[PDB]
Design a protein around this ligand. Sequence first.
Ligand SMILES: *[C@](O)(C(=O)NC(C)C)[C@H](C[C@@H]1CCNC1=O)NC(=O)[C@H](CC(C)C)NC(=O)[C@H](Cc1ccc(F)cc1)NC(=O)OCc1ccccc1
Ligand SMILES: *[C@](O)(C(=O)NC(C)C)[C@H](C[C@@H]1CCNC1=O)NC(=O)[C@H](CC(C)C)NC(=O)[C@H](Cc1ccc(F)cc1)NC(=O)OCc1ccccc1
Lengths: 305, 305
Amino acid sequence: SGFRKMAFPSGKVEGCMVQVTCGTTTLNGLWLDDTVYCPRHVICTAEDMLNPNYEDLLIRKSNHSFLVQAGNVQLRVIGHSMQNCLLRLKVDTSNPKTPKYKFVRIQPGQTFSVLACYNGSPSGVYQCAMRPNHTIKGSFLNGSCGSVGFNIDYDCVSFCYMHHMELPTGVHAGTDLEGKFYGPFVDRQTAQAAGTDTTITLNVLAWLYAAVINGDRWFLNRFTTTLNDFNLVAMKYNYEPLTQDHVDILGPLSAQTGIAVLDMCAALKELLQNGMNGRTILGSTILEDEFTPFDVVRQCSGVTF
Amino acid sequence: SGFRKMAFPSGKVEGCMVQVTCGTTTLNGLWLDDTVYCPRHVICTAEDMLNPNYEDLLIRKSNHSFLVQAGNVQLRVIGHSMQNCLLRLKVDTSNPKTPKYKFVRIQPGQTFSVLACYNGSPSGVYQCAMRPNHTIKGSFLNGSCGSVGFNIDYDCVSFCYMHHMELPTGVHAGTDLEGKFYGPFVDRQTAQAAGTDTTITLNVLAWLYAAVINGDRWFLNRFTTTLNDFNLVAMKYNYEPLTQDHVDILGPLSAQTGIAVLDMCAALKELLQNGMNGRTILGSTILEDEFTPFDVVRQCSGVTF
Ligand SMILES: *[C@](O)(C(=O)NC(C)C)[C@H](C[C@@H]1CCNC1=O)NC(=O)[C@H](CC(C)C)NC(=O)[C@H](Cc1ccc(F)cc1)NC(=O)OCc1ccccc1
Ligand SMILES: *[C@](O)(C(=O)NC(C)C)[C@H](C[C@@H]1CCNC1=O)NC(=O)[C@H](CC(C)C)NC(=O)[C@H](Cc1ccc(F)cc1)NC(=O)OCc1ccccc1
C-alpha cells in the first residue's frame, strides 16, 4: 500500500552523463555510443546571449574548442555538428555503459524522471510532468543545463528531455533529444513567458482511481454526468476538457475498480464545486495532476482493497 | 530555482540488489562484497508467521535451502548466519559493483531515498522521512521486502533501512542494516500499531528558510517569540517541541537569509494560528515536514534571491 511520486531508477542514465566545456562555459552532456549531446548555447558568451547567431558562432570553433570529461577521463572530440538546439560532438571513445535507448518526444500531460546534474555529476532524481503549457516545474540551478529527462521500459531508456532554461515564473523549458524545444520557446535571453497553464484532467481522474484501488471511496457519489456537462464545469475551474479518447484510456482502471469513468467524473465535479472539506486523498489536501493512468497502473496493486 | 522532493541517484545501489528465495518465499537482498543481506522472515511459511521461532527455523536449513539470483546469475551460498532480524548469506562470488559504503542508523526526522525493488529488480526511487513514531510513509507492495533506504555522500553510500512490513494504517516499518528494527516493532504478524505521530518542527522551519532562499517572504512578520512560548503553541498543534540544539542547527540557513530563528518561529506560530489563507509556499498549500535543513542546503542556491 501507499502512493508516492516515484522516479525511475537512474543507474542506466548516470553512466551517460559527462561534462562539456567551451571557453568559460561548462554544462552537462549525454554520452551515448560515440556521440555527446549538449545544449548548443554552451558556445555562447555573456555578451552574445541576447541574440546569438549559432551558425556564425559554431563555424568559428574547432574540435579542440570543446573539452569533454567523463569522470576523470578526457574524451577527445573528432567531429561536431549542430542539430536544432543541440550540438552533437563525435568523440574518440564509445561509451561502454551505453544502455539500450531511444529518443522520444513526449506529449503534454505525460511524466518523466529528471536526473539533475552539475559538472557532469548526478546530484538527484525526481519525477516531473510536461505541463499543458510545455514547461516543467523542476528544481534546476546554474550549471544544470544538459540534465536529461527519461522513462524506462524493461531495459530500454527513452530519453525525452534535455534542460536549457528557466523562465521568469521559476518554471523550466528545454528540448527533446533531437534539439527541438517543447513549446514556443527559443534559446536566447529575449523576453519570453510561459502561456497560461491548465490542470491535467486525465491525470486527476487516474489519481482518483489510485485512491480507490488503495482502499479509499469517500469522495464517490450516486450521480453521473455527460461529457459535455462535465466539460462546462472543467472550463470554469481551468481543467482540460475531457475527450472520448481520455475516457477510453481510463477503461482498465475503471474495470479494476468497477467505477464508470463518467461516475468518477461526477465525483470530480463534486470535489471541484464543494472542495475537500478538510479531508485528504492519498495523503493530499488538493487534487493531484502529475500522475498518468500508466503511472497509477505501474505503482498500484493489481487488486483493489 | 524550484524546490522538489529529490531522491539520491540510485545507480550505486541498483548494482547491489539481488533476489533471495527460500521454499516458496521470494524477496530482495543486498549484495555487498561476498555477503547478501535480507529479511530473516524469508525462511517463514504462511502457517508459522504469527509466532515463528527463527533460531529453530534457521537451524533446520542448509546453505542450499537458499537460492540467490543476481540478474540471470545464480550465486551459491557457502555459509549463513542470523544477525538480529536479518540473515547474512555468505556467497561464492564477491559483488564487483560493491560501492564504497557504510551502515548507519538514522534518527527520527531524518530523510533517505528508497529503492523500491521486486524480484531483485529495481522499479522506482523516492524520498522518505523517518517519522517520530519510527515508521515511514512509503509505497510498498507484496514482494518489496528487502528493498533498502540510503543516503549518498561523495561516492559513499550510507545504507540506513531495509524494508520488512506494513502496519494497519498503511505505513511501513523495517530495520537498519544490522537488523535492529526502527521503533518497537517485531517481525511477527501479532497485533501491532504505530504510536501517535507528530509533525517534525525542525523540518518545517528548514523548508520555510528554503522558501525565503527561493524568493518568497509573504509569511514573515514583525514579531518574535521565546522558545517556551513557541513550544506552548507547538504542543497545541501536535508539533515536536523545539530545542536549543534545533535552533543551533538552523544557524547557517538563518545567516544566509538574515532571518533570526526565533523570528521564523514567530512566522510559523502565525501560520499555525491563522492558516495559509489560500496561499502557497514552494507550491504547497500545507506546511511540509519531510525536508531536513541539510536537504535544503543541498538543493537550494547558496545565494538568496
Ligand atoms: C543552463 O544554460 C546552465 O546551467 N548554464 C551554466 C553554464 C551556468 C542555464 C540553467 C538555468 C540557470 C538557473 N536555472 C536554470 O534552469 N540556462 C540559461 O542560463 C539560459 C541560457 C540560454 C541562452 C537560453 N538562460 C536562462 O535560463 C534565463 C534566466 C535568467 C533570469 C533572470 C535574469 F535577470 C537573467 C537570466 N531565462 C531567460 O532568459 O528566459 C527568457 C526571458 C528573458 C528576459 C525577460 C523575460 C524572459
Ligand atoms: C515482505 O515480507 C514481502 O514483500 N514478502 C513477499 C514474499 C510477498 C512484506 C511487505 C508488505 C506486503 C504489503 N506491503 C508491505 O510492505 N512483509 C510482510 O508480509 C510481513 C511479514 C513478516 C512476518 C513481518 N507482514 C506484514 O507486512 C502484515 C501485512 C498484513 C495486513 C493485513 C492482513 F490481513 C494480513 C497481513 N502486517 C502486520 O502483520 O503487522 C502487525 C499486525 C498484525 C495483525 C493486526 C494488526 C497488526
